[PDB]
Symmetry: D2
Subunit: 133 residues, 4 copies
């Protein structure tokens, strides 16, 4: 119990393939309402370019996302400031803001975020940390 | 959640409405947005700031208040939306709106012509304003 | 003209892994100027997401793009008309207009563009055709 | 000759200040990309209700045609500029050409103004032409 990591869309995407390795740790994981849509839009672009099992895959992504705790939305107010100050998009900035102000570890697969978010790690790093418990 | 909601407002509409507070404020219980709406409105203001909007900060505070006035619905099932996306040739983001409006029997208010076309019962901000003026 | 096919970003991106299969038919393969940027952006997103071999891969992509002939830019007002009438992005509409306008076969991996561009085909269909020659 | 490389956000604003720069056109160039980005912005406005999109598309055609068009950069290079300076491949494309070509990047994008040596905005470009 008690959230420790905030997972963004590219991290969630990577994680969907290691279900077993982390579900037992699902209590330490969270996302934003935003992630659901971003994961969806990414699955959508794949179906647009030919992914055949998009439907089945769509069900599995749904199951993966259901495993996570969902945090409250950050104030648009603050996020914009962080986006303007760090050269991030409003989307990425939302994760950086919530992670730092909430004292959480931001798991992302983006190189820009890892570098502009204090304490940010990648999916792999998250895995070693979880396996060590 | 609530139930006095008749309209689902999207980012493009919300943005237009932001400059017509008075005409709809007293009807607020009738309008709703999705969580996604918060980020989309933000991303739009963000782009203006990136392009040199002087008052982005002040404007962000205003946009914030405007958003606080709306009821926020629950997130839709991912798979359903993806299907609507694929079927009507919409982005997953825009399909989230079409699905929720039609699934809940709500009127989608959008400024996007494509959405108006593929979402049954959808109206634009102007149409929304007239309907409110008469009630 | 000897050119028969207009290849877009999604087509071009896949084609890059079947170099030998089309390189001999190259003089029948063309792209738009936009194609360069779109392809570079796709690789960029991959690097932003942790693609280690992005330095070397960008070189392979350059070579790939160099094998294609580059068509002249379409009229903005025409491309917009198509984008608005068929519900396509301006970028996508470009390919639709040029291909149909020039009597070429649009090769796209985008279901949306296939369904909306008269004669459009996918990469697989392109290969089988070149195979018959 | 060419002195300034104008991107999409800049090209778009300048389209309202035609008389202020035509006579200076030969000093103005874009990328092939600039055509697609401009058209995509008008498309968004048309999608969002703009009524005079057809007419507006013609004026944009004329404006865009008044600019020389540089050769496409080595996808090779550009990518590097973008990874290092945290830009997108599109923006980086402009930072590369202007620099590697000793041109002054003209952009309405704060992020680019700051990551491209000697880059200036629309207003800045307009005061200069006023002088010359
Ligand atoms: Cl960025
Ligand atoms: Cl679309």
């Amino acid at each position: 119990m008690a959230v420790e990591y905030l997972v963004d869309a590219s991290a969630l995407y990577a994680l969907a393939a290691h279900y077993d390795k982390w579900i037992k740790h699902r209590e330490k994981l969270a996302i934003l309402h935003l992630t659901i849509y971003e994961a969806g839009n990414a699955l959508w672009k794949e179906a647009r370019l030919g992914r055949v099992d998009w439907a089945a895959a769509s069900r599995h992504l749904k199951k993966v996302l259901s495993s996570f705790k969902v945090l409250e939305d950050p104030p648009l107010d603050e996020v914009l400031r962080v986006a303007v100050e760090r050269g991030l998009t409003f989307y990425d900035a939302s994760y950086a803001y919530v992670a730092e102000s909430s004292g959480l570890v931001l798991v992302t697969q983006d190189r820009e975020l890892l570098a502009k978010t204090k304490g940010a790690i990648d999916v792999e790093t998250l895995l070693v940390r979880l396996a060590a418990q």
